[PDB]
Design an enzyme around this catalytic site. Structure first.
Site, PDB file in Angstrom:
ATOM      1  CE  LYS B  48      -3.358  -2.485   2.939  1.00 11.72           C
ATOM      2  NZ  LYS B  48      -3.837  -2.803   4.133  1.00 11.72           N
ATOM      3  CG  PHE B  89      16.911  -4.566   4.533  1.00  8.83           C
ATOM      4  CD1 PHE B  89      18.031  -5.813   4.289  1.00  8.83           C
ATOM      5  CD2 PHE B  89      17.026  -4.046   5.742  1.00  8.83           C
ATOM      6  CE1 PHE B  89      18.706  -5.998   5.127  1.00  8.83           C
ATOM      7  CE2 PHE B  89      17.694  -4.149   6.813  1.00  8.83           C
ATOM      8  CZ  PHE B  89      18.887  -5.224   6.388  1.00  8.83           C
ATOM      9  CG  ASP B  94       9.677 -10.922   9.191  1.00 11.06           C
ATOM     10  OD1 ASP B  94      10.042 -11.084  10.526  1.00 11.06           O
ATOM     11  OD2 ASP B  94       8.400 -11.196   8.678  1.00 11.06           O
ATOM     12  CG  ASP B  98       8.944 -14.457  10.765  1.00  9.91           C
ATOM     13  OD1 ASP B  98       9.926 -14.719  11.728  1.00  9.91           O
ATOM     14  OD2 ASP B  98       8.337 -13.206  10.984  1.00  9.91           O
ATOM     15  NE  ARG B 103       6.048  -9.920   3.268  1.00  9.57           N
ATOM     16  CZ  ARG B 103       5.709  -9.505   4.481  1.00  9.57           C
ATOM     17  NH1 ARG B 103       4.653  -8.822   5.012  1.00  9.57           N
ATOM     18  NH2 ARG B 103       6.501 -10.137   5.637  1.00  9.57           N
ATOM     19  CG  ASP B 165       9.647 -11.350  16.261  1.00 10.39           C
ATOM     20  OD1 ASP B 165      10.277 -12.515  15.832  1.00 10.39           O
ATOM     21  OD2 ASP B 165       8.418 -11.142  16.266  1.00 10.39           O
ATOM     22  CE  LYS B 191       7.027  -7.850  15.750  1.00 11.07           C
ATOM     23  NZ  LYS B 191       6.623  -9.175  15.263  1.00 11.07           N
ATOM     24  CG  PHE B 230       0.687  -0.822  12.029  1.00  7.11           C
ATOM     25  CD1 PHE B 230      -0.141  -0.611  11.220  1.00  7.11           C
ATOM     26  CD2 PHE B 230       1.810  -1.673  11.822  1.00  7.11           C
ATOM     27  CE1 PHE B 230      -0.119  -0.770   9.673  1.00  7.11           C
ATOM     28  CE2 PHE B 230       1.869  -1.926  10.297  1.00  7.11           C
ATOM     29  CZ  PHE B 230       0.848  -1.622   9.395  1.00  7.11           C
ATOM     30  CG  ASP B 234       1.150  -7.674  11.330  1.00  2.00           C
ATOM     31  OD1 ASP B 234       1.026  -7.424  10.132  1.00  2.00           O
ATOM     32  OD2 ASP B 234       2.069  -8.398  11.752  1.00  2.00           O
ATOM     33  CG  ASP B 235       0.990  -9.335  16.738  1.00  3.83           C
ATOM     34  OD1 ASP B 235       1.614  -9.321  15.600  1.00  3.83           O
ATOM     35  OD2 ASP B 235       1.616  -9.237  17.903  1.00  3.83           O
TER      36      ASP B 235
HETATM   37  O1  LIG Z   1       5.385 -10.947   8.548  1.00  2.00           O
HETATM   38  P1  LIG Z   1       4.794  -9.739   8.957  1.00  2.00           P
HETATM   39  O2  LIG Z   1       3.418  -9.999   9.668  1.00  2.00           O
HETATM   40  O3  LIG Z   1       4.677  -8.627   7.992  1.00  2.00           O
HETATM   41  C1  LIG Z   1       5.816  -8.853  10.191  1.00  2.00           C
HETATM   42  P2  LIG Z   1       6.286 -10.009  11.631  1.00  2.00           P
HETATM   43  O4  LIG Z   1       6.852 -11.011  11.215  1.00  2.00           O
HETATM   44  O5  LIG Z   1       6.824  -9.087  12.526  1.00  2.00           O
HETATM   45  O6  LIG Z   1       4.615 -10.351  12.287  1.00  2.00           O
HETATM   46  C2  LIG Z   1       7.196  -8.671   9.705  1.00  2.00           C
HETATM   47  C3  LIG Z   1       7.585  -7.218  10.432  1.00  2.00           C
HETATM   48  C4  LIG Z   1       8.898  -6.786  10.545  1.00  2.00           C
HETATM   49  C5  LIG Z   1       8.891  -5.674  11.395  1.00  2.00           C
HETATM   50  C6  LIG Z   1       7.778  -5.170  12.073  1.00  2.00           C
HETATM   51  N1  LIG Z   1       6.645  -5.505  11.882  1.00  2.00           N
HETATM   52  C7  LIG Z   1       6.642  -6.720  11.052  1.00  2.00           C
HETATM   53  C8  LIG Z   1       5.107  -7.533  10.863  1.00  2.00           C
HETATM   54 MG   LIG Z   2       6.976 -12.004   9.687  1.00  2.00          MG
HETATM   55 MG   LIG Z   3       8.657 -11.668  12.015  1.00  2.00          MG
HETATM   56 MG   LIG Z   4       3.049 -10.450  11.511  1.00  2.00          MG
END
Ligand SMILES: O=P(O)(O)C1(P(=O)(O)O)Cc2cccnc2C1
Ligand SMILES: [Mg+2]
Ligand SMILES: [Mg+2]
Ligand SMILES: [Mg+2]
Ligand SMILES: O=P(O)(O)C1(P(=O)(O)O)Cc2cccnc2C1
Ligand SMILES: [Mg+2]
Ligand SMILES: [Mg+2]
Ligand SMILES: [Mg+2]
Lengths: 340, 340
Positions: B48, B89, B94, B98, B103, B165, B191, B230, B234-235
């Protein structure tokens, strides 16, 4: 050597580096700061420190002794450690991407039980520490922005070089057709020469107030050639070096890399040796790797390398004659003695 | 909204970004520069753009219109794209760490056939592009060093947050004991809050000549609280959001994450619900994940979140009343409207 007598003080400065970088306590980040400590200790310690010591050695040789304060020497040792941290960032990521096993006589960070791909973020953190240190030690100095820009540019160049390294070595494919001397020289200029050789001397230059375009250009002319040799040597040792000495196990053949060895092989191979290479390179099987090493020995590549080292040493010295002035030749000579 | 009417120009500026960054041709690096192009196109496009647009929107609201030159607006759009590149980046790395699948409505970069862990270096390259762009566009501006330092510091803070994290979510372990509200708030401040909310407004501030410590501190007070919400959102969406809307598949439960949901679960769970959580969380089995989601629904967590969003919105507005002056409230109001 002059690297010998600067080493101990430089290495001892590490505990100070780690101390200053753990003092961000923000009690809430305490666990992360402890992880950072662990990462620094595992990944910045245990090599020869030649890049960081190069900053310190060149600083002592370019700065007026009357200007070699306690504080300005602390800054030199800090900037030296910045170069070592840049190295640590690149090596942590490189070992992941090259599927390496050991480094500096211990298993690779990412292979440690409980680390794995978390090592990607650890590597980014090492990078971040560079600029944190530059701010902390050098922020009020005239050369501050010059050093920031130099480290960032050196990182960009190294990353471009790593890009070409990886593009030229696609996993589980072929053509040896990609593996040319031209391609090789471009890979190593970018991935190795800038950060390993130009960076540390340039950083000392800027610290000494030598910021001139032509002075940096002439220095670069020597240092980039040194960097090409150093990477050729690294490629040779990947296969033919003693792991007790190099600290690490070679992966170039299995990884399908544009190594100096494969480029030299291809230049010499009969059509039939070519087919053996093509059938055996780029694959994990110990038997296939051994066949490649046997081809290399059949073609006397180790003797080719020893001859190359001689011709290269003589070429680098000829460049120092041409290009060193007005800097002390010793700045280049000490470096060349360390690598050759 | 004011984000609506800045979007098109901002997005169109991307082709210019990519053009300027591919002009490093040094013909020898051509293949790497083409890879960089591919990486930019895959990883900087398709979200976005709210962070980058925030720089542009705030720039228009803080800079005297008479000072809104063609050139200074090019710089704003560039600095906006710098924020988006910083995001790219962090997201590339991430998703690897993860073990994510998609994405922004396509498979994750590292999951693409032929990319894999080479994506680590691609991510570093995205980072490098930030500072290349700042040099190219902003090098002669009074705020140049301020922006360099802000982006580096924001990266360090984000990496510290990613560290926490990952430390709090060790793969294939337990204790829910780590998952506290205190821990959670520290994770997300670092983060998410700094780079997503403070960075873009701060960057616009510096570009507008607003460099004052107290002005940045007051702005930070609003923006860090927005950032916490925010990340809570997201969570929540990780589990309860529609993938057609979020663009991505949730992995928090399988990844053993200190999500806002698990922290709220634990605060509410009976001893018996606790044991179900402990038996089912942090594991890849679809059946176990479904059990966790069922517990969350049993505890009305979605209703808890909706109530939280209301209380948080009202708190953030109270902070804007307190802290916005002397900046236009609109700068914060537009942002809050985008997120809430
Ligand atoms: O993978 P997303 O949900 O987009 C994620 P997170 O992995 O932290 O949930 C990646 C990220 C990285 C830094 C701050 N917030 C976020 C959201
Ligand atoms: Mg993630
Ligand atoms: Mg993450
Ligand atoms: Mg997330
Ligand atoms: O793994 P090493 O042999 O230490 C290696 P490469 O992977 O390039 O051979 C890593 C690396 C990275 C940048 C410049 N040279 C090198 C040498
Ligand atoms: Mg390697
Ligand atoms: Mg490598
Ligand atoms: Mg090697």
């Amino acid at each position: 050597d002059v690297y010998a007598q600067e080493k101990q003080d430089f290495v001892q400065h590490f505990s100070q580096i780690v101390r200053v970088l753990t003092e961000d306590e923000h009690p809430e980040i305490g666990d992360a700061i402890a992880r950072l400590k662990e990462v620094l200790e595992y990944n910045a310690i245990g090599g020869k420190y030649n890049r960081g010591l190069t900053v310190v050695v060149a600083f002592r040789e370019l700065v007026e002794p009357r200007k070699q304060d306690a504080d300005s020497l602390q800054r030199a040792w800090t900037v030296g450690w910045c170069v070592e941290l840049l190295q640590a960032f690149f090596l942590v990521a490189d070992d992941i991407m090259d599927s390496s096993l050991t480094r500096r006589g211990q298993i690779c960070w990412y292979q440690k039980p409980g680390v794995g791909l978390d090592a990607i973020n650890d590597a980014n953190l090492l990078e971040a520490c560079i600029y944190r240190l530059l701010k902390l030690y050098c922020r009020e100095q005239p050369y501050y922005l010059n050093l920031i820009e130099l480290f960032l540019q050196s990182s960009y160049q190294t990353e471009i070089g790593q890009t070409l390294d990886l593009l030229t070595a696609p996993q589980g494919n072929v053509d040896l057709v990609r593996f040319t001397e031209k391609r090789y020289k471009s890979i190593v200029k970018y991935k190795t020469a800038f950060y390993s050789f130009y960076l540390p001397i340039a950083a000392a230059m800027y610290m000494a107030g030598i910021d001139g375009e032509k002075e940096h250009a002439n220095a670069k002319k020597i240092l980039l050639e040194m960097g090409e040799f150093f990477q050729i040597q690294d490629d040779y040792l990947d296969l033919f070096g003693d792991p007790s000495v190099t600290g690490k196990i070679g992966t170039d053949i299995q990884d399908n890399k544009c190594s100096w060895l494969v480029v030299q092989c291809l230049q010499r191979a009969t059509p039939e040796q070519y087919q053996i290479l093509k059938e055996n390179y780029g694959q994990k099987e110990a038997e296939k790797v051994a066949r490649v090493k046997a081809l290399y020995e059949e073609l006397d590549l180790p003797a080719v390398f020893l001859q190359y080292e001689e011709d290269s040493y003589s070429h680098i010295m000829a460049l120092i004659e041409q290009y060193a002035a007005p800097l002390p030749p010793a700045v280049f000579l000490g470096l060349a003695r360390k690598i050759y």
